[PDB]
């Protein structure tokens, strides 16, 4: 509607797998994926901060060998029952699993919950998806 | 490493949000906030780029009866047997569905996957969370 | 401590792949196999008409093509959401699946649950499985 | 067809709370009964008879804090990778799992691995819903 142009300072490497990433994509160039970033952004982050009701599906891959990564994920788990509903759990390998945790409730004490979850130690990768 | 500068042509409304949401957060500069939002863009798609072998889970919603969606994500699931390996799903109200599905796979065949389930009539939307 | 002997009339066809399975086992004999039997029976039942608080998993396989079970399915399992906690199906083939429903509650409304489902149309196989 | 007929020792306490839920249930005859519980144990055994493939659910209940119960099942899982597909595990209280895990292979295999299973300083009892 009134567009305006401001300048980033961003390390070369990072820039450049993103414009790897983004022409991949089928972007025509940055500022058209950098705005995406920024609009999906403010979007997830209003419900974050919604202390509202969701659904949600916590992924995460974890080598179950490191420390005790799957006593914590339990003790942790069990501690937070009205919130988790039930969890899916797929062994990838000998030595790594992939699990996928439901969870329902208060945004901001799923949100809290996913983020201790994914805090944990052996935990290598994660992320939330809610739902209204 | 080498740190690059560059700008972006952005519409006010959009960039004002944004600023707006960065103060209550507690950043410095925009040049923090966009940083992250690329390295985690990065953190979500870098296996959209090559062939490597990937794994994750694709979280859907939608309407059990809204259409033929059902018998239509079946079919398709079907379909793609060997990459697709499990599903949970729960039900969130009379109507709604969430439904985490488990995958493993090559890049190319899972995104194409993870596209042709996406674009259904009756697939109210879905994010993916995949790695290698 | 006191043992009455009794006698029953069975067709020989099952009577044999009784003895078949059985001789499988490792069992010595048939009043010692029926007894077991017996003896479950009398226990899986007093818990069916208990009436208390269960959890159960009930596993079925049903080619989702024949009729609208997938329909029913969901329509009936949509219908009780507070006895339903999640679901797991698993893609057999290009008609057949495996999905094992989790159900929490009444024993009397649950072992009545598990009927309804299982006594679908496309219902090929199905068993329900209590806890305390 | 032919119906055999022949007789069982069994003990009369036995006995007595069969008859006696026999009544309740409404059967006409003991042999009634008997057939079936033996028709039903022979449609949840017949994969033991042979090697033809399996698939199906492995429910069981465990505590994990009592004993290494849950590393223990991890390893255990993770050794057999090829038949056991996924798992769903509820928890029920703040020490209680309840995890039924999808499997498919050949019946001799299955049976070791679910007898490895149920047998574990952890498993507190688990059911089997076999079919091919
Ligand atoms: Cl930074
Ligand atoms: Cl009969
Ligand atoms: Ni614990
Ligand atoms: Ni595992
Ligand atoms: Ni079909
Ligand atoms: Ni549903
Ligand atoms: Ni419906
Ligand atoms: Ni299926
Ligand atoms: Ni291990
Ligand atoms: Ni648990």
Redesign the interface.
């Known amino acids: ?15 450049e ?2 414009d ?2 983004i022409e ?2 089928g972007y025509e160039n ?2 058209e ?3 995406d ?3 999906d ?2 979007i997830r ?1 209003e419900w974050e901060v919604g202390n509202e009701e969701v ?1 949600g ?1 916590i ?1 995460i ?1 974890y080598n ?1 060998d490191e420390g005790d990564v ?2 914590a994920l ?2 942790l ?2 501690e937070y ?1 009205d919130e ?12 790594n ?2 699990e ?1 945790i ?1 969870v ?1 409730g208060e945004a901001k004490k799923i949100k809290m919950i996913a983020d201790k979850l994914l805090s944990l130690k052996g935990v ?2 994660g ?1 939330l ?1 809610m ?1 209204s």
Do not use: G, Y
């Open positions: 509607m009134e567009l305006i142009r401001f300048s980033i300072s961003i390390p070369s490497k990072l820039l797998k993103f790897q990433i991949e994509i940055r500022s994926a950098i705005r970033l920024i609009r952004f403010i982050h659904a599906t992924t891959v179950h799957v006593k339990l003790d788990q069990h029952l988790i509903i039930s969890s899916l759990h797929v062994h990838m390998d000998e030595h699993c992939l996928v439901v329902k290598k990768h992320k998806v739902t």
